[PDB]
């Protein structure tokens, strides 16, 4: 509950390091998509 959270809670990145999961995942999984298919399809 806010009121005395002050700066504990960041609006867009609450902790953010907890989201290391998607920091890494989105980063890595989306590069897979790009690497595989864009090395076979001509750019598009």
UniProtKB/Swiss-Prot annotation:
Subunit structure: EF-1 is composed of 4 subunits: alpha, beta, delta isoform 1, and gamma. Isoform 2 interacts with HSF1 and NFE2L2.
Complete-protein stretch covered: 153 to 192 of 281
List of residues that carry Phosphoserine: 14
Protein name: Elongation factor 1-delta
UniProt family annotation: Belongs to the EF-1-beta/EF-1-delta family.
Induction: By homocysteine (HC), may mediate accelerated synthesis of free thiol-containing proteins in response to HC-induced oxidative stress. Also induced following exposure to ionizing radiation.
Tissue: Isoform 2 is specifically expressed in brain, cerebellum and testis.
Compositional bias of kind Acidic residues: 5-21
């Amino acid at each position: 509950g806010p009121g005395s959270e002050d700066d504990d809670i960041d609006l867009f990145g609450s902790d953010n390091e907890e989201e290391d999961k998607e920091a890494a995942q989105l980063r890595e999984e989306r590069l897979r998509q790009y690497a595989e298919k864009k090395a076979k399809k001509p750019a598009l």
